[PDB]
Amino acid sequence: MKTEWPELVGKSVEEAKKVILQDKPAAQIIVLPVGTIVTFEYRIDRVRLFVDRLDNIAQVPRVG
């Protein structure tokens, strides 16, 4: 059961959403800007996607 997606770094946010929902269909996906500060609670159902100003994935997506 996949919890990290290093292969999605540099892909579009759209492709990342698609891929993550194939592996984890009940994921709560939230898109946020890379280089923001975020809450440090752990949510096993959540995958935050950190995007650059072009809307590409800028950091390895992981569950949490």
Would you tell me which residues interact with another protein (CB under 8 A)?
Answer: 30, 32-33, 35-43, 59, 64
CA distance 21 to 38: 22
- For another protein, the closer of residues 26 and 42 by Cβ is 42
Distance CA 35, CA 24 (A): 25
Handedness of CA 7, 9, 10, 11 (dihedral sign): positive
Q: Which is nearer to another protein, 22 or 62 (CB)?
A: 62
Nearer to another protein, 26 or 36 (CB): 36
Q: At its nearest, how many Å lie between another protein and the CB of residue 10?
A: 17
